[PDB]
């Protein structure tokens, strides 16, 4: 109804990224997670969560696609 457009974008991109990684579409999934990270700005807590959640090589694709 008001602001919070960035918050919607953020969660939608995380969720789509997650879904694509699960279908095995790594580049696309990583693309969308990095859209979420880009709108964060203090993404240190987010990046820790992602590191604990993703297989290491998928996480490394993320750090590179930033």
């Amino acid at each position: 109804k008001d602001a919070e457009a960035v918050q919607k974008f953020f969660l939608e991109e995380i969720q789509l990224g997650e879904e694509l990684l699960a279908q095995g579409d790594y580049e696309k999934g990583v693309d969308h997670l990095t859209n979420a990270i880009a709108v964060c700005g203090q993404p240190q807590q987010l990046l820790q969560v992602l590191q604990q959640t993703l297989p290491p090589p998928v996480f490394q694709m993320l750090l590179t696609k930033l």
Binding site: K1, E4, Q7, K8, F10, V39, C40, G41, L46
Partner: peptide, 12 residues
């Protein structure tokens, strides 16, 4: 609003 969106973004 949507709490889930607010809470999820709180860390940013």
């Amino acid at each position: 609003p949507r709490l889930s969106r607010l809470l999820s973004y709180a860390g940013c």
